[PDB]
Design a protein around this nucleic acid. Structure first.
Ligand SMILES: [Zn+2]
Ligand SMILES: [Zn+2]
Ligand SMILES: [Zn+2]
Ligand SMILES: [Zn+2]
Length: 111
DNA sequence: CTTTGGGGAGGGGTCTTTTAC
DNA sequence: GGTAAAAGACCCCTCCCCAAA
């Protein structure tokens, strides 16, 4: 949509350019009034408030288990299916999180 | 020794909803 | 009444870090 005036990086998000250039300041305008811990963006503050309020919006269809994070629900699925989701296309190894697969590719030669 | 698994964080994208023109 | 930009809601990703395999 538009280009960053500082880092000259293009953002495809509509209206997300102000969000990007606000990170260069380093400010944390959003503050948790309970724990006095400040975050970078409003949505990050909102998910942090789930810790204090105890809300568990993510539900398992069959288990009924409630989790505060989407990935926690995804990990719970692995106790039902027993399937490790991420797979390396060359070394034929499996991983339980996406960054673990990325770490394997960068750090090791896979083979 | 290296590798794995998870917590917490920041950073971008898409869809929708509000808001300022 | 209409339009476009920003904010929200939620999604995804990787990185730093470190007990635990
Ligand atoms: Zn920038
Ligand atoms: Zn808090
Ligand atoms: Zn379940
Ligand atoms: Zn591999």
């Amino acid at each position: 949509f538009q280009k960053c005036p500082i880092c000259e990086k293009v953002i495809q998000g509509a209206g997300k350019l102000p969000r990007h250039i606000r990170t260069h300041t380093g400010e944390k305008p959003y503050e948790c009034n309970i724990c006095k811990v400040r975050f970078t963006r409003q949505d990050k503050l909102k998910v942090h408030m789930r810790k204090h309020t105890g809300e568990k919006p993510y539900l398992c269809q069959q288990c009924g288990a409630a989790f505060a994070h989407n990935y926690d629900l995804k990990n719970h699925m692995r106790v039902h299916t027993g399937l490790r989701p991420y797979q390396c296309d060359s070394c034929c190894k499996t991983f339980v999180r996406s960054d673990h697969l990325h770490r394997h590719l960068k750090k090791d030669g896979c083979n």
